[PDB]
């Protein structure tokens, strides 16, 4: 039908002066047509104590006073390399208040999203490369759903492939009120995580969507090779079933 | 992930991708008339017609790979008196399903009696027949191998207005939902827990059915779209809207 | 292949993904009123308004990588007399473009005079002004850096009916096309050979503009969608419909 | 908008008894979830003098008496292996009259599509593995647009990769009246070919879409790993610009 508001963007390539991206922290574009979320040295080696994010310029309308909530899909391809086989801390796809910025000291385990481990409102999927078991991480690389806290509401084990290009697929289904992620490498296993959450209880009506990454003492390239996003809001739709 | 999607926003005479049974015709004002109408727009009694999409739908493969699906249609039910009958149904059947003998009126072109082919239907039931187990108002109903609905919702049907019907089958949570709506009115919604891979064969046809009996109405379809995704039941459904 | 797509089928007050300039407002009956209307639905003279999508559009990258694009909008132009003015335009500008001084009436909110910002527009011109080079009937026109159209087609505009406008830029063949249509009427169509990567900057905003002067009309937008694909000019465009 | 007829199918996997595919000649499904268009021996070696095709079951509506023509996209992934480095004869995506069958003696250079080299109406894109310069092939592997004749209207050189999975992307744009193909391997060059042709001059109003392959004296696996098709027809659209 014809009763739907929608936003779609796709980057298969990033250049210098990517005017439709807001870059925060150490994030740069247009090195080999990639988005580097964390600082990489002149020789290609990642740096510690780094944090960076890229947000799409247009705000996204995610719910309305009718309790009608947008459905959305995000897809990105990433390259995490750690030459020392000591990677940290990971990549996140997030949804935030529109004027959200990098919280003070959100390097390392806090992934550029949270100021502490329990100002800004965050819903994220984490690709978490480093287990911090003292803040509820399982004791392995994992994907997680983060609702207003780095202490994931749900996690699944993630067999991350040092130096391989992987794909993350984020799905919000507003019929089911379910946030899900699938992370995969070619000719390898997929990891998946789901969590039931109505975003009209959690986020503002208007948000920005972004990618965030951090390093700490340990470090990794947090390289994004492509990023696509689609959001659909049908204002005259039944808000729940 | 195997997929089928079709969309009719216009019908023509000789619609080669539809199987028309009974009194069904396509092309009059670009519409599908499931039941007999006179040249003047007068609907006839004792009429039954169905339209099936020509292509069979792969509705399950294994315990891991099953099909989520969605159907939408827009309809115009009109009678010259206060007493329209008998209604419109969206159905999934065995691929070689035909109209059962005497299935006019209350049996909606789907069932030989009120308790052969395997039928799962969502019924837009305009006429309450209390002796075959209808509630005593017009209703939307989920029918699993029987005209006696497993679950119904009251339907405030508007004689002579264009309505929208939206059917959702979630193969992960095992839930069949229907929403029916007119402009500026609250929707009717019904949901029922049913694993369709235990009821239906591997291959199905999907269709629209409609009937009149003693009482009569136009059973005019203005549009009909359908999407089926045969996929892992470990991965979450992407919403359509 | 970088892509942007948006679709408005409904506008709200505080549409954060639109930049409103001049007299433009959003939300009255879920519509975008580009020019001033009274509470009773009476359009005012000497009015000008534009809506720009918040996100900038990457319209070329290199001699190999350039953007094909498509825009559709639906509009209601209504006056109480036989004499509506001055019309609606779809435009591409430099990203920080604002309404030029005195651009009401015949200049359509796009141009300071009839021969600053870089403007490329498709004009739905409701009022023939022969001294700034309009033909002597209502027309659709392609405007490249000038209100004096490079090419026009006669437009049989229907006061008080909902029209559809469809703009296509083919970056391979270097051709800017517009089609305007009402239900049950023949379309008006105009095409013009122009390499937009020689006229426009690398980054643009896209927008709708409208004006009234001495004579007046409603400049109501009911929907607006846009797709831009920045891709190799060795590969063929995929049509939208 | 809401004025479009559409058909979409996607196969990422083929099983035995693929009821929505018509198989012709030597074509089989459900060996390693693949479609084998030509005969492969029990040990995995391709056979000579083989021809086979797979057609989608639902007919596709490609034009109307208004001269409105469908736009369409087809994508497939294929594996051509010849252990002897002597491959023939190739794969084609085609569009035919609905009841089209394999012409007598269409093995080898005739690709399962034509009865001779100058009953059925064919438009095809060929992935031609074997140069027959006496019927106008260039003297290398090439992609070709075939309008009612194996003597390609347009060809481009194709650097085919023995034993690699490749992707073919077929585009018909009805705005441009242009049939195009792109053929690619991962981390390798793309080959592209285009030809201007209005299909309402060439095909029936209703068609089937298919894949065809042949071997001759020389042979290759003609393995299809995935196949997707989308066709859109907007009946109230301007038929040409
Ligand atoms: Ca961690
Ligand atoms: Ca099976
Ligand atoms: Ca009944
Ligand atoms: Ca719905
Ligand atoms: Ca540039
Ligand atoms: Ca004028
Ligand atoms: Ca159009
Ligand atoms: Ca050949
Ligand atoms: Mn974690
Ligand atoms: Mn009932
Ligand atoms: Mn003009
Ligand atoms: Mn050839
Ligand atoms: Zn809610
Ligand atoms: Zn089941
Ligand atoms: Zn150019
Ligand atoms: Zn034609």
From Swiss-Prot, chains A, D:
Keyword annotations: Antiviral protein, Calcium, Glycoprotein, Lectin, Manganese, Mannose-binding, Metal-binding, Plant defense, Signal
Entry binding sites for Ca(2+): 89, 128, 130, 132, 137
Cleavage (site feature) positions: 236-237
Residues that bind Mn(2+): 126, 128, 137, 142
KW Zinc (keyword) present: no
Alphabetical list of Pfam families matching this protein: Lectin_legB
Residues bound to a carbohydrate: 89, 109, 217-218
Molecular function as annotated in GO: D-mannose binding; metal ion binding
Alphabetical list of PANTHER family matching this protein: CONCANAVALIN A-LIKE LECTIN FAMILY PROTEIN (PTHR32401), LEGUME LECTIN DOMAIN-CONTAINING PROTEIN (PTHR32401:SF47)
Designated name of the protein: Concanavalin-A
């Amino acid at each position: 039908t014809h009763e739907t508001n929608a936003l779609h963007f796709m980057f298969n390539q990033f250049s210098k002066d990517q005017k439709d991206l807001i870059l925060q922290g150490d994030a740069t574009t247009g090195t080999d047509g990639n988005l580097e979320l964390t600082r990489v040295s002149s020789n290609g080696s990642p740096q510690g104590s780094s944090v960076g994010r890229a947000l799409f310029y247009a705000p996204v309308h995610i719910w309305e006073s009718s309790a009608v909530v947008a459905s959305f899909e995000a897809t990105f391809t990433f390259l995490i390399k750690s030459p020392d086989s000591h990677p940290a801390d990971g990549i996140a796809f997030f949804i935030s208040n529109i004027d959200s910025s990098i919280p003070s000291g959100s390097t390392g385990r806090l992934l550029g999203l949270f100021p502490d481990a329990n100002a800004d409102t965050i819903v994220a999927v984490e690709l978490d490369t480093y287990p911090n078991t003292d803040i509820g991480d399982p004791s392995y690389p994992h994907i997680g759903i983060d609702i207003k806290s780095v202490r994931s509401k749900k996690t699944a084990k993630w067999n991350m492939q040092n130096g391989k290009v992987g794909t993350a697929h984020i799905i919000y289904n507003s019929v089911d009120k379910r946030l899900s992620a699938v992370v995969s490498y070619p000719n390898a296993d997929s990891a998946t995580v789901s969590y039931d959450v109505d975003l009209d209880n959690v986020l503002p009506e208007w948000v920005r969507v972004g990618l965030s990454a951090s390093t700490g003492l340990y470090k990794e390239t947090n390289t994004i090779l492509s990023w696509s996003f689609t959001s659909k809001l049908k204002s005259n739709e039944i808000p729940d079933i």
